[PDB]
Amino acid sequence: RKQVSDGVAHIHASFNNTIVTITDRQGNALGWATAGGSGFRGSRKSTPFAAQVAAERCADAVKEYGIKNLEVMVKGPGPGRESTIRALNAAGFRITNITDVTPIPHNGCRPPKKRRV
RNA sequence: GCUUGAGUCUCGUAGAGGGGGGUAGAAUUCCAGGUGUAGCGGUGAAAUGCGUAGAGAUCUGGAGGAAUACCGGUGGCGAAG
Numbered sequence: 001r002k003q004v005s006d007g008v009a010h011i012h013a014s015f016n017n018t019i020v021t022i023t024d025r026q027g028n029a030l031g032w033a034t035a036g037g038s039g040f041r042g043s044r045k046s047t048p049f050a051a052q053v054a055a056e057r058c059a060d061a062v063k064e065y066g067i068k069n070l071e072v073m074v075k076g077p078g079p080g081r082e083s084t085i086r087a088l089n090a091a092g093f094r095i096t097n098i099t100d101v102t103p104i105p106h107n108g109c110r111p112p113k114k115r116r117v
Numbered sequence: 118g119c120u121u122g123a124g125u126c127u128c129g130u131a132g133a134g135g136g137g138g139g140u141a142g143a144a145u146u147c148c149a150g151g152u153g154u155a156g157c158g159g160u161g162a163a164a165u166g167c168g169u170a171g172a173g174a175u176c177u178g179g180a181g182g183a184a185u186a187c188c189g190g191u192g193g194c195g196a197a198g
Contacts, residue, residue, distance in 0.1 A: 012174065016159070019174060027176025029153045034173080037155070042162060105144035106186040 006069040006096075009088065013078035018051050020058050020084065024067075031061045035080065051080030052087050059091035070095045075102050 004024045012019045021032035035050040038057065044050065070093040074081050089095050 008175090010175070017157085017173095019157095021153090021174050023152085023175055025176095027152070029151095029175055032153070032174060034156070036157080042160080103144065104186065105184095106142075107184055108144035108186090109146090109183070 004065060004067050007065070007067045008071050008073065010073045011075065011078070011081055011084055013074060013076045013081040013084075015077050015079070016046060018046075018054065018078065018080045018084065020054055022058065022062060030065060031058055033058045033061060046079055048080040048083040051084040054080075055084055055087035055091060059088065059093075068092070068094060072098050073101045074098060 007022050007024045007030070010021045010023070012021070017034060017036050019032065019034040022030050024030060033054055035054045036045050038050070038053055040047075040050050070088060072085055072088070072095060074085070078084070085095065085098060
């Protein structure tokens with residue numbers, strides 16, 4: 001409907017997935033799409049190429065809004081995160097800045113006991 | 118008998134030493150919302166499980182429990198824990 005020209009992107013980046021969702025600095029969501037929502041499975045769904053395709057299916061999914069400026073909130077380990085930031089840059093968005101917003105607890109809770117092979 | 122051992126008094130310095138009572142910010146979880154769709158989750162690959170009664174993701178508000186990131190250093194205190 002309307003125009004923003006400067007939105008916000010959020011790349012949740014797990015070791016198993018990398019979901020990318022956009023809003024306009026208001027929490028009112030606009031467009032979301034996952035690396036897993038495109039037929040990919042197994043290790044294939046955890047590749048930076050899956051990140052590229054995901055970026056493309058958000059970029060096309062936002063053409064009506066047509067923002068020309070982006071800020072990216074990269075969170076969590078990213079295998080595919082490393083390449084997602086420049087795919088959007090090429091998708092017709094002059095990314096202003098990147099920000100590592102990975103939440104760090106002040107020893108609030110006991111973490112789960114990780115893999116023990 | 119004596120004052121060197123051992124004790125007492127006057128004056129200050131450092132400290133995660135101990136007990137009790139207050140309070141604070143991140144973080145996880147749940148609930149109430151607003152937006153928002155087909156996925157989420159995990160794996161060697163899957164499956165159980167979760168999702169159209171609207172999940173996952175995003176912003177706001179609330180509730181409860183536990184512990185206090187950097188400072189931090191084989192640095193400090195304590196008879197040991």
